[PDB]
Amino acid sequence: NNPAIKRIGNHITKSPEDKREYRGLELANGIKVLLISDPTTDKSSAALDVHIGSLSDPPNIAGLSHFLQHMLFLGTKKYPKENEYSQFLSEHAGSSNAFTSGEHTNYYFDVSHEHLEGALDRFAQFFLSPLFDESAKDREVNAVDSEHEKNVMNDAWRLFQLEKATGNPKHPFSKFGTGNKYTLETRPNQEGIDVRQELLKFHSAYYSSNLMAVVVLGRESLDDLTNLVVKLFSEVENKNVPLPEFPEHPFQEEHLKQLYKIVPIKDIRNLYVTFPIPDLQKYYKSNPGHYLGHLIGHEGPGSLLSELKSKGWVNTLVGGQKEGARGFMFFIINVDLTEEGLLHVEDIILHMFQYIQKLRAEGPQEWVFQELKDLNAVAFRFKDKERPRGYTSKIAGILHYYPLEEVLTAEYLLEEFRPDLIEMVLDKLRPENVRVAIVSKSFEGKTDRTEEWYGTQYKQEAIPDEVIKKWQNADLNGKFKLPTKNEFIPTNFEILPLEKEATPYPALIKDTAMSKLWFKQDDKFFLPKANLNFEFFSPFAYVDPLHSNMAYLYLELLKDSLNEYAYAAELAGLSYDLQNTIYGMYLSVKGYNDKQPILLKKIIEKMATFEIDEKRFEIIKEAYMRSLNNFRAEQPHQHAMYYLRLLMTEVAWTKDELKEALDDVTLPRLKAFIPQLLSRLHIEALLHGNITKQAALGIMQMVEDTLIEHAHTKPLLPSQLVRYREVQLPDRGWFVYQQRNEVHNNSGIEIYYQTDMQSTSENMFLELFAQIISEPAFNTLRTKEQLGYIVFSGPRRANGIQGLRFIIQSEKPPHYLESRVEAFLITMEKSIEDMTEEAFQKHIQALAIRRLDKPKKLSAESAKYWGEIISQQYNFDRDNTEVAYLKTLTKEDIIKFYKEMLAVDAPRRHKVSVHVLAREMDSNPINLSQAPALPQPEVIQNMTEFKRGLPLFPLVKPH
């Protein structure tokens, strides 16, 4: 009947717990479409995936596909305002982004459910009549260069592109993907190329409707959603572009039996073992790569990782199938290297082929496939409700790979047990096919090659045939047994009935000297899952740097101890998180509630009766030292945030302080630390999910009784439960802390306009002003001025205080960015006075929609509560309370707030700035808007003296 629709998909199989409505379509022009009707969703969303990516980049214009991705946002024929897309979304509680892989370009947005169409119309125009304005082209090319510049000093990106540089250079795999100013402007303007033509030429060539997939999720009916998609997208022209495919592998014979010695930027020691394999995508129901990844990557008793760990050679192992484009895949094994493991790489690789040989000797195991099949089956049935933005983006990508009806299940459910494919893949994992990469600072100065795009220092060697042969004659190693039946797989998925006295927010069901137990039985999601969060308080976890180091190492050793045992539970959807905090320890247990108390007890017993393996202690301590040192190579803007956190917190130990004190951490001193840490505690816990009140009370009591028994834990005094305060900046003051980043050749800056203690009033003044400036700050400071790829503004909340913050990472010096952001602030003062009275209320409803967005999954709701609890504020109805007040704010209230707190001449201005200089930046002192003249900043020369000379804020009264 309808001619714009080539077909409609029969029922789209979904989880029986998924209340959303689905319909599959293929438009006349060949666009595969999935429509999602959720009358609940507070935000609607849509996404489009083009099966074109970096691999289709022209050889002479590296990165064109990624650059074009940036350019669709900046103006259409029907919506030619450069930022009409960003502006429309920002004014309607929306967000958007996109990425570019080798074979895909993925665009997605979300917006208030009442404006899906308006957003979708502006969005669809991306693929119909993009302007590619010559002025915006010359500006946005800098954003791409900042993005690459960011990644140049990143160890992961360097390895990523080093592999591409290592294979067949004729293969598209070797293409530089990111793009930068050289390949997108300098070199083209050198070769006479009109880039706007090549952007138009490419878009018109590859952005065909036959290579497109669309997902739209909104409150609208499935029929209404069908009409909408047909209305806006059926006019995309079908150029019948043949889908690019790459049968020939990027690694041929001459690229096998090769070894690479690579110099990293951080101090890391890693070993990568890779095998070229055929594309396993088609076998999505047999899934042989996962079967082998599951066994080879296993961390339980009898596993490869175990023996490598026991011999002190490796600490972590990751294995499985790595994606390449259509027609070629990889199999990777990734181990980090201890100081010893670096010297026994030959043996480590041998041990790898010994385990692989075991897998060949045992043959395919149907029970293993059954276990994997059953776990995925459960996982899909009780899948968590996704956020609309990420859900449309992911579905939009896999519409290209599976039938309309299988699109939801294809990546989860298993069907065929294929022992032939298991042997077929397993046969490609052989020493003649292997490629070895070693990453260690120990190759410093010993490299004879340089990777052109990132500068990576490396040396290429052929693996001796004598060594290949050793690997081929791999005996069976009696230390490698297959795993056993996973006893942690859940069997009881019964949702307990909702108790009479249940509450909508967490109830304080225990307030003893040792425990403060917050509890809420789930009344929204009804999945067999629960979240168990515990905060352990001890003044001895952060009393001084030495004790912080031991707090860390204690838990790192403890987790190391349990890993073998706990790994099974993780595969079974029962995971735990355990880490030291500036107040003590944090333990969270999330997953299926069935086997949950068994794991929780094993943890607390291990905590209270922990016995340290000295060999593990020395190895973890060494990795910890490198972890600290390796912070010198982090992004400049993260340095900025790091420093400011040190500057404004009452107590805070710097990395250097920790690093210096780490040598004094002997095994004896650690053994003494642990029982002292556990001797006096206060536990504040949130138990939330599919559990009853007395199950929770029993959980909490069991945790206590275990500690009391084995660690003789007494309570802490209420006066010991002191939280840290934030430094109180003086009226009209401006302080500047300056540091250099010795690794990255960009600079970073954070600017913090401290306002006042958190309050229902002061909270919303800030949040509303931050909303009004959110999009403009990005549009002015990045899109126009192109200060850098990373440009962020928004609230900063810490220790009960708050304020406005800007974060920029740029090539320009920090003191320059200071003026440009200062200039931008005056731009807003006018922008508000001229801003219409409706546009003001527009921003209010936008914030309101965001603040009231209902959590979709249990974990997300638990986080809301857990924030209220660790912040000592316990404002569980905060969203209704604070949004209500927000709506009464007037355009005048915000101007008084700005003139009094934020303006350059504000009476109560509180400005502290962190300047992180680039690696080579000398020690620093048109059509643009006017920057105001700034006072002389007081330069923090010493952080300890800075805090001594300033007051400390109070702490927010709770409730």
């Binding site: 990425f99 570019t100 790569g289 996962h290 990557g297 192992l317 990751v318 294995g319 790595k322 990777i332």
Partner: peptide, 12 residues
């Protein structure tokens, strides 16, 4: 740890 299967992003 089994890992199964970058991508260059538009925005910070």
């Amino acid at each position: 740890h089994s890992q199964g299967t970058f991508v260059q992003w538009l925005m910070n």
